[PDB]
């Protein structure tokens, strides 16, 4: 579903994910791409090393600013097709939903579905 998985083989992702979790023990690797069939501004950077104690709402705000969204525009995250709890931290979100390559994948959209 993510173009990052298609352009990077799983073996390279899993190896780098293992190394990143060793080099940055207080951070978690996150890949953020626009959800398919979404109508919202583009995100420039997709690879994020965010602290394990950063909340989802703070990461929400960071991605909002990079897309340059207006105050009236919506931004929903999807982790494995589910909107994550906003009060949770990125470490909790990572420790529960990280894929086999040790990367956390988050899709964003203007709508609250898919």
């Amino acid at each position: 579903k993510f173009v990052y998985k298609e352009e990077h083989p799983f073996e390279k992702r899993r190896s780098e994910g293992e190394k990143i979790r060793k080099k940055y023990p207080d951070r978690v690797p996150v890949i953020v791409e626009k959800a398919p069939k979404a109508r919202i501004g583009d995100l420039d950077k997709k690879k994020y090393l965010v602290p394990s104690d950063l909340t989802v709402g703070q990461f929400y705000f960071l991605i909002r600013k990079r897309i340059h969204l207006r105050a009236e525009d919506a931004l929903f995250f999807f982790v494995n097709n589910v909107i994550p709890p906003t009060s949770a931290t990125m470490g909790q979100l990572y420790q529960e939903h990280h894929e086999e390559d040790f990367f956390l994948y988050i899709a964003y959209s203007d709508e609250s579905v898919y």
């Binding site: 990143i20 090393l49 965010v50 602290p51 950063l54």
Partner: peptide, 12 residues
Amino acid sequence: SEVDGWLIIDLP
């Protein structure tokens, strides 16, 4: 702040 394409984010 990037290392081979990874953005380093600090706590606000």
